Amino acid sequence: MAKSKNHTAHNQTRKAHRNGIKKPKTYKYPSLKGVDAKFKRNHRYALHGTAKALAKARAE
């Protein structure tokens, strides 16, 4: 009495291609989330030291 259509993927790719399918956008610096914590911890100190060394070198 209420038997109806169960499932179909008809028209679904047509809908997806109206405004997609968009590639995700890339950046020069990726987020360091999910990167190994030990590496990320030391990478903080390396970037900090580089900034100080460059600031000192620019000073003299």
Partner: protein, 159 residues
């Protein structure tokens, strides 16, 4: 009812190759992966730890993280009208360097060498690849090669 478990439908994809069962040859564990390498994902059925999902079997991605026994690979997956950045942790038994990249680096080296040669020689070299062109003209001799006539053959039965 229906069954949609984690490894459903992987009966053949996760089987080992014929007469290729048993221990992993150690070259798998001696390869070195760096962040930014391009790797192919292939599940090894004998290593149940750090496996890909069946979706990532046969996909290729970028290494973004390196741990004790595994790498993190970035994959783009289509979900509806856009891609989603996926991050998968894979033990190195399920990963392999991609060969096309090493070929492309070969081309970069060769191209720099040629441009340096032309620079130091006083000429200019064109370095874009080109698709196959139509062939040019040519003259064919008949010395020992008189054209031989062929005809369609009659029908025959071999029962």
């Amino acid at each position: 009812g229906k069954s949609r478990g984690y490894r459903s439908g992987t009966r053949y994809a996760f089987q080992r190759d014929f007469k290729k069962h048993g221990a992993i040859p150690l070259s798998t564990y001696l390869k070195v992966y760096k962040v930014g390498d391009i790797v192919d994902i292939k599940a090894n059925g004998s290593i149940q730890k750090g496996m890909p999902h069946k979706y990532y079997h046969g996909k290729t991605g970028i290494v973004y993280n390196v741990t004790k026994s595994s790498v993190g690979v970035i994959i783009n997956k289509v979900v509806g009208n856009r891609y989603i950045e996926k991050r998968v942790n894979l033990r190195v038994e399920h990963v392999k360097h991609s060969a096309c990249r090493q070929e492309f680096l070969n081309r970069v080296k060769s191209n720099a060498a040629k441009k340096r040669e032309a620079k130091a020689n006083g000429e200019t070299v064109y370095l874009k690849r080109q698709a196959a062109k139509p062939r040019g003209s040519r003259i064919i001799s008949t010395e020992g090669n008189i054209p031989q006539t062929l005809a369609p053959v009659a029908y025959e039965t071999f029962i």
